[PDB]
Every structure is written in structure tokens, then in C-alpha cells.
């Protein structure tokens, strides 16, 4: 059964499990002959209801398209010999660290300059994938990798897809129930299906806050609980602060706390301290997606062009 363009994954030796992905198990492995490290992401063809998952087809398409210094790199796609069935493995370039691990490790200390550099690389990645008409739809600390050389990589595009600026006419009806609840923006929780790049930058704000809090800032347990936490921290969701939010079928059917004033800076002051940092976080966690800052504006924000300028990570990583 000829198959010249799909090597067997046997060429790599699995070393350890490293978490559960959007649709599979992930293993660290090294090439048996060269020692090149890779990450094997196993396509879990459990959902045999529709054959090969469209989610994986999208991921493969997108990662064949996106090539950027801050986007994870797909090397190849491998198979297993029919033993008692076959499986497909996505082979990625390996990254030593993930942001969540670094933030949980107490010996790792970030300088303000290094946080600036992390957020700069992050927003470069988001800028690149957005300008290539791709939504990530799964921004979270655990999906932000950092290599040994301190180069940030956006990862886990299993939930990503292409989007349209279409067309002053029939609006899109994208998949609503996306993004991990803690990093999910308000519009998705209110049932928005014609959303866009702004949802990823909401996650960037949440991630930027974690750079100082070392812990997710809104750890809700339900979609309603999460909405309540968002109202508590960012202020109440009202037409006054979010024009046309009335039009959401569920805006009143869900009942959102109305008294809460905005307390983002008030509550984060003690952790962030830096004024510019607080301002950028404030612009990233805006409720109305139409007013939320975009990658380019974020990258021109004074946070990235005031002293101390961003610096390389290599220093902080060795601890």
C-alpha cells in the first residue's frame, strides 16, 4: 500500500506526555537518528461520526499557511501502520516552555522589560494570524509557548478558522461556543456568532494580567458565573457602554448585574503597578468588542515605546 508522502511516526521516539490538546494527546519525541526534538499531537479519531475531523483539516490548512516567527511551526504529518487501526500525528517544532508553567514556577522572575517583550511577541503573532484572516479562538496561557532562546510562539490552532470581512451584507454565523471559559470575551457569552479578531485580544489582555498576577484573573465555573465575574471587574454590560447590546436575545434573559462599576485598574494596581501597563490592560479588557484595542494599536501603545524598552528573555528563563 504505497504512501511516499507520509512518513511513519516511528522515526520519532516518544519521551513523555505533556498535556491534553483540543482533540488529542501530545507527546515530546526525538528523531531516532538526528535527535531533533518534536511535539507529536495525536489526532483522536474518536469522532468517527464524520470521518476525519474538519477541526484537524482546518488546523493542517492553517498551519501550512501561517509561517511566522511567533507562530508555531508544523514540520510534517505522520501516520501509524495498520496494526488495530491507524492514527495521524501532527509533528510540531518543540518548545521548551509554556507560559502557564513559567507563571506557576516561583523561581521564574519576570522584569517589566521582559513582560513588555513577551506581550510584544504575542501581539506580533496575533497581528500576523489576523492579517492572514485567521482567528485563533483559544487564547490562553497554556497555548503560549516560549522556546529556549526566548522566542514566543502561538500554538494549538485546533480551534482556529478563517473568517471574512463579508460583505456589508449577509453576516457570518460562526461557532459561538468557543474559547476556554476563563478567557472567553463577553460577546461570545451573550451568544454572538458574527464576532471577529477582537475575541483573541481579549485573551491577550487576560494573559497580560497573568504576567503580574501569576493566576487567571477571572476563574468562573459557569458561563453565567463568568459573565458575572466580567461584570464585577470590567463594569456592568449596558447599552450605555456597549451600544446595541440590547439586540442579543439573551441580554435580559440571563440577567447581568447592573450596579458594578469598572474596577480593572483599581483591582490590578497592586499587582501591575506600572501605569502604562495598567492602561494597556484597560484597553484590552473593554467590554464592547467594537471599542477593544487591536493588535496594531496595542503595538503602537506607549507601553512598548516607553522606558524600560523590551528586552530579551534568555536571562529570566535560566531560573
Amino acid at each position: 500500500v504505497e504512501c511516499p508522502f507520509c512518513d511513519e511516526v516511528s522515526k520519532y521516539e516518544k519521551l513523555a506526555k505533556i498535556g491534553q490538546g483540543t482533540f488529542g494527546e501530545v507527546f515530546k519525541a526525538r528523531h531516532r537518528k538526528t535527535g531533533q526534538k518534536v511535539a507529536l499531537k495525536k489526532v483522536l479519531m474518536e469522532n468517527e461520526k464524520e470521518g476525519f475531523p474538519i477541526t484537524a483539516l482546518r488546523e493542517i490548512k492553517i498551519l501550512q499557511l501561517l509561517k511566522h516567527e511567533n507562530v508555531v511551526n508544523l514540520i510534517e504529518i505522520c501516520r501509524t501502520k495498520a496494526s488495530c487501526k491507524g492514527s495521524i500525528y501532527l509533528v510540531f517544532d518543540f518548545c521548551e516552555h509554556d507560559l502557564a508553567g513559567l507563571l506557576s514556577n516561583v523561581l521564574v522572575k519576570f522584569t517589566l522589560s521582559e513582560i513588555k517583550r513577551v506581550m510584544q511577541m504575542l501581539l506580533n503573532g496575533l497581528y500576523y494570524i489576523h492579517r492572514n484572516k485567521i482567528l485563533h479562538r483559544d487564547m490562553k496561557a497554556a497555548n503560549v509557548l516560549i522556546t529556549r532562546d526566548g522566542v514566543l510562539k502561538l500554538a494549538d490552532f485546533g480551534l482556529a478558522r478563517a473568517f471574512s470581512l463579508a460583505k456589508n451584507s449577509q453576516p457570518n454565523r460562526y461557532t459561538n461556543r468557543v474559547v476556554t471559559l476563563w478567557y472567553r470575551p463577553p460577546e461570545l457569552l451573550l451568544g454572538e456568532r458574527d464576532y471577529g479578531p477582537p475575541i483573541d485580544l481579549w485573551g491577550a489582555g487576560c494573559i497580560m494580567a497573568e504576567m503580574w498576577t501569576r493566576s487567571p484573573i477571572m476563574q468562573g465555573n459557569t458561563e453565567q458565573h463568568q459573565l458575572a465575574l466580567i461584570s464585577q471587574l470590567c463594569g456592568s454590560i449596558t447599552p450605555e457602554v456597549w451600544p446595541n447590546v440590547d439586540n442579543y436575545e439573551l441580554y435580559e434573559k440571563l440577567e447581568l448585574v447592573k450596579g458594578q462599576k469598572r474596577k480593572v485598574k483599581d483591582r490590578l494596581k497592586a499587582y501591575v503597578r506600572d501605569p502604562y501597563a495598567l492602561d494597556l490592560i484597560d484597553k484590552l479588557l473593554v467590554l464592547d468588542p467594537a471599542q477593544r484595542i487591536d493588535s496594531d494599536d496595542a503595538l503602537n501603545h506607549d507601553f512598548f515605546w516607553s522606558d524600560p524598552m523590551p528586552s530579551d528573555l534568555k536571562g529570566m528563563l535560566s531560573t
Binding site: 478563517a162 473568517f163 471574512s164 463579508a166
Partner: protein
């Protein structure tokens, strides 16, 4: 047969089903009804 604006995203492209059902007549009108008719009727290619 009918052009489609390539700038449309894949999920936006219109469906290929012709407005009228394919017949078995081989007249001029019927030989250019759609791609299937043209390939089978006008060019004589069939799989069955």
C-alpha cells in the same frame, strides 16, 4: 458554467445545482444545460 467571484470565502460560494432538472433530450438547449450535461451529452463521456 457560471462564474463565481473568487474573493468570496469558501463557505460563501453558491451551490452548483442547476435551477432546472437535467433531461435526456440532446437538443441544443439540453447540451449546454450544465457541466454534467455538457460533459455527458455534448462530449459523450459517461461512467455508467
Amino acid at each position: 458554467m457560471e462564474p463565481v467571484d473568487p474573493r468570496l470565502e469558501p463557505w460563501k460560494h453558491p451551490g452548483s445545482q442547476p435551477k432546472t432538472a437535467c433531461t435526456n433530450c440532446y437538443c441544443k438547449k439540453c447540451c449546454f444545460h450544465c457541466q454534467v450535461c455538457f460533459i455527458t451529452k455534448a462530449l459523450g463521456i459517461s461512467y455508467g
